Amino acid sequence: SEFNVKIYKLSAYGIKPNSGKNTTPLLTSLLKEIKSKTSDLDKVIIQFEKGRYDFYPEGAIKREYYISNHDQDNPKTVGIGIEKFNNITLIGKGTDLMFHGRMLPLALIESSNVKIKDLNIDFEKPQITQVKIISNDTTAGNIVFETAPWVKYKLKDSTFYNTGEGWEMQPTSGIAFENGTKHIIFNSGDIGVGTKSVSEVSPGKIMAHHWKNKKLVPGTVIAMRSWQRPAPGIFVHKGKNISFENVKVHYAEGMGLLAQLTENIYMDGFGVCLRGKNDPRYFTTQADATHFSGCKGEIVSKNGLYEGMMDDAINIHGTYLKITKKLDDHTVIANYMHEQSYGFDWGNIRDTVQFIQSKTMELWDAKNTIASIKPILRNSTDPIKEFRIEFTKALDPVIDPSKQDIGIENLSWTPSVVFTGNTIRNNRARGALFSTPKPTLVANNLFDHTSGCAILLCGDSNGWYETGSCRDITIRDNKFVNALTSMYQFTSAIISIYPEIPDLTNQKKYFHSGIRILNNQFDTFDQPILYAKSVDGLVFTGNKIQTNKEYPAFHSNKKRFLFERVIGVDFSDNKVDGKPIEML
Template sequence: MTFKTTMLKKISLLILLVFGLTSTIQAQKKTKVFKLESYGVLPDQRENSAPLLEAALKKIKSEMVTADSVVIQFKKGRYDFHTDGAVRREYYISNHDQDNPKIVGIELEGFKNITIDGNGSDLIFHGRMLPLALIENNNVKIKNLSIDFEKPHIAQVKVVKNDTIAGSIIFETAPWVTYTIKDSIFYNAGEGWEMQPIAGIAFEEQTKRIVYNSGDIAVGTTGVSELSPGLIKAHHWKNSKLIPGTVVAMRSYHRPTPGIFIHKGENINFENVKVHYAEGMGLLAQLTENISLDGFEVALRGKDDPRYFTTQADATHFSSCKGVITSTDGLYEGMMDDAINIHGTYLKLLKKVDAHTVIAKYMHHQAYGFDWGYAGDSVQFIKSKTMDLWDHKNTIVSITPVRTTKNEPIKEFRIEFAEDLGNEIDPANFDIGIENLTWTPSVIFTGNTIRNNRARGALFSTPKPTLIANNLFDHTSGCAILLCGDSNGWYETGASTDVTIRDNKFVNALTSMYQFTSAIISIYPEIPDLGNQTSYFHSGIRIENNEFETFDHPILYAKSVNGLIFKNNTVITNQEYPPFHSNTNAILFERVLNAEVTDNTLNGKTIDLLNRE
């Protein structure tokens, strides 16, 4: 490199730095700060902040100039939100119950270039609410706040006595639980709601880990009697694993709303935001481009929190998003499902109208009512039974909802494509799914801790580059990582083609059995007819330099993969629990091509872990 070239590079770098600094200063000069206390939204009043904040946001929006960069600040403290006076909205939220209207605590709609700074505030919700909805926003940051509910819809109880011979259990309710007993049935109750728990998750009292090999359990909420306030005898509850001291989160399977709902946004960022409880997922985003989570938590309130659970379902969930999804330095614990799930949604092809036009439909009861695609989007087609993809890709020319009235939620679409579909792509020949390739994201999932949760750790289903690195998966009760894809039941797309899993640590994952959990890392597309599959579903998967501490055998399971590397990984066995999994192979492949399994160690010894039977 010449002296002149070096100097030119230095000058160019200096210009860029000066320009960046100037831009930053200009941006700072244009930033306008609105303090919510000036609009009557004050902390620690124990009054209903919902209508006050709604009025303040409307006023602030009217005072904003389009070019403004705006910061809206809470004064640090506690803010309570009740259903009375809160806005009602019709939202169709992916992977949630499609009941409407939703009662919304805070709605941000149509904002641009704003930051909501909570200054460490606690937002406490009451009843059954959607705490925070972000609708069609651009360049929005939420930071320094937490979301919680005064009375969660999960009833936490502790086992006091377990008579396994008589088949009865005495339990005590946590201090914050309000309950009623009617006709010998236990109901958990709160502001404007009441429900009978029908299932439970059992936690070890001291560690807050889910009880080994327990999974979802039945709970004794029918045939109960009150021995004294807060002390209940379940006369027909038999489970030998529930030793005295065991804490049980008694729950239903309802998931009406997430803690945070993001719809049709662009450049949405979260920094130091915590969700301590939500009746659905912690955060659900759909049809949004570019989302970053920096230090995001779905977590307990520290080690002294008396609760053992967080959200009713996934910590975070991203449906039909695009751009880049980033989660860095997060904490996900105690939730009743996965830490993160990223996917699109297959439509089922119902009818071929002509060579360019089809009728297609949302199939899962928790996924409908929102847009699926737009003119110009790229799509591909899949045979549902074998999960074989056609090489034929196509482009949407037009897509129109098929419904009798505008008030009817969207379930079906009439879609016209740019190119002839050919004779084979016809629902008369096969069950066919359609995947929208445009609405698929790249993923960066790094530096996160996932622990003590139900079901699985992290799920990724996207053809774009996916990096899973430097994370700790600690006692996830199902598998730690799942690469899936299903055009038959969940209808969640799709094929992963560029996945790197490196430098992660896995500690005693897979302590219970759940769907698709065949190993700590499970590559498990749902393929009803694997024997007649002619191609491969997933490809381009690299698993390198990870550390597995495990009490059981299965480390990696893979099905229908072309191109898989498992290299330089360390496996260390322990005796924390007895092995129980039906899969006794460290590595088990079904229909896998071009696999490299090399330089892995088991208890310090280099060994071929692959089952080659």
């Protein structure tokens, strides 16, 4: 073409801000055309203006997607489908993409060199229900709660439903928040909610007749929810060189950003957050803010704001298949085991694999290489639950599924990580999960009142089936303020290194190695700073621990440092309230 970049200002093509019309069928039809014309090396930009674009289900594409760490409800109702479309940039100018009903806002499928920039994603009617405690009669167990202004509910058979366009969902749990600070209420975590046995006092004032909780003082704001997570805000599958710059996801029925089987991801200014100090909402995403399942290359996530999520800010991990059958010396059948991670590819020819003894979480040193890999399917349409993997090298007969439980990590689909200069706060569960053997830098982050623990290095081939023996990770120059006001799975200390190990007494081999924790600041009211299970090599140096009394100490673990099957400890130049603490 006669142009280096072909720029499509959307308003020039019949797609205007603040029209209040359904943008879905228009942008869909338009992209389809721009695609059919642009050859491959051709570069494209799609440009939104200031103001608001609404997207509804009607006229949306219906894609069958399998999404890591999410409910496998199909089809998905997809707002914007970037599919097999390269060198494309979606850009806005303080733009507000507003979605309605149950939708997957943005899907990036099998696309390279995609950039998303200066653009916000939100739903008008979040499936999460915000309410405010009006009166709590602790004796009778009567709570009156006020629905927030934007909430449309129905009562049917004394049951509280939350509604939006084409959906109706009864909340079963919640997260309580301090009024004002927007912290999560001390020792709350997941709590039951009084959505059964209800009746209407007056519009937007609901009486719960059998709700007993002394913690829900007048003023407390509660995010009532279910466990459903069918679609993330931005889904990315099989991307190469993907970019997000100044992109905020304010809410989605699932994770903010879920990227899988993607090589190289760059994020500057990514937020999953509120619209500022004046946002009436206390909550953001129904699940994790950002999530990276089975990625590779380099992941940069910097200068982000994550707040009020119903889960972690970042989670970086792979998937252990479980071997169900050994056909011969070279060939096994292996299966996806969790309900929320199946239906997508796991590896390719030439991938490096290693095997794990699930019961004691011990690696075999003998690595292998995939020679062949084919999903096993009765009908073509069926989803990928089960593979037949062939290795180049023969397997030592000790690797037989009828002898013990054996898992497979794909060491090729593992990304390197830079997670710097972010702010995480006021969110459910942990702050950040890292599970990658590749080099990882976690630096100059602020963990301001995470509900659970700040950082979690896990690994589990029994429950979650999420890989991550760590080998190389520096957690430096971070600030951790009053982490762990509430318990969740694995929250044993501000930094918890907690692999899921069924049989620890019999473990000979250390699961994690090469962990350096240098020059951090821990502002805490409690005791537990570091918990470490099954580590060979653990540096803890130059760290400052400052005590405060913003809350009562309470954690069962009353030890600053708690090690279990840990060798290789280097511990120097640490302080507590400006006084040294040495091992010797």
